[PDB]
Design a protein around this nucleic acid. Structure first.
Lengths: 114, 112, 109
DNA sequence: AATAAAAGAAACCGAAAGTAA
DNA sequence: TTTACTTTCGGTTTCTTTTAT
């Protein structure tokens, strides 16, 4: 009934967001760019695109109707990632203090029994 | 299965020690205790707690051991509905304990 | 149905400050609705109404159950939503002021 | 120093599934 | 079965305290 799992899998499977790539061929671990908005390498378009995309895809942000607030978009996805049972951050694999920094996440498989 | 069987039958089930938690509260035998546990709770075991409901289903024609598939929720609902509408029984709702372990309801027997 | 009468009764008492009628026909009322994280929020006064609903239904027992104001708030909110006896006037609600509240109109039968 | 972004935790929401009477 | 709430689901928004430039 949720949308985050399928949606994010789709954005990675698309080549739309550079740095949003699978790390393995088994499609279980992926990399998600996570740049601090204050950095010099940061451009609003390319780095905020994934967060804006989630706000567009849910009804939250409507282009031309609403005033843009990019930190809000990032907070939504971060908190959504944290809370979801579908995603587990591999905190020992995240690279946040480099140019082109990223976080590493695992998509949990569904459970065996009921 | 027919009319005028509920009152005496339940009195008989209380006077026997067969159903744990189905005991009299007074010596005048006008008020009694009936376990009323949610089937999902952890303490719930199907045998002991569904026994009274299964017993009513057997005593009336509704359940036949070995011929029909058991449905404990159906037995509970059937006996519940009988108690509410019964002129022979009146719930003392101010003494019932439904949000405790081994929860129960308290009922008063209407004299004629 | 106990909510319709119970809530009408809670408004008619002056017990909960901010739980007041807006009109003289007793069809529309104001129900305080503050976020529990805000600074003005005090646990006793603002959760009192939700606490009262939890008491009046069997859900909370003083001294037997651990207090959970967030669950109290959720139950009352969801109850109002499903109620055919209650309809929120969303064009009147004031959620982003100090002392925020919601506005509800009582459906006549 | 200052301004802006960011962080976890928890309270929060509607919708729907669930439960009881 | 209808009415009437209550609980659960899948994220979302807020609160307060760090972190980045």
């Amino acid at each position: 009934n949720g949308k985050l799992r399928q949606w994010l899998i789709d954005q990675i499977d698309s080549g739309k967001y550079p740095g949003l790539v699978w790390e393995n061929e088994e499609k279980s671990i992926f990399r998600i760019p996570w740049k601090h908005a204050g950095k010099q390498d940061y451009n609003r378009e390319e780095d905020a695109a994934l967060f804006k995309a989630w706000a567009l895809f849910k009804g939250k942000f409507r282009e031309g109707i609403d005033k843009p607030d990019p930190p809000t978009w990032k907070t939504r996805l971060r908190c959504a990632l944290n809370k979801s049972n579908d995603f587990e951050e591999l905190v020992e694999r995240s690279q946040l203090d480099i140019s082109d920094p990223y976080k590493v996440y695992r998509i949990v498989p569904e459970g065996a029994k009921k």
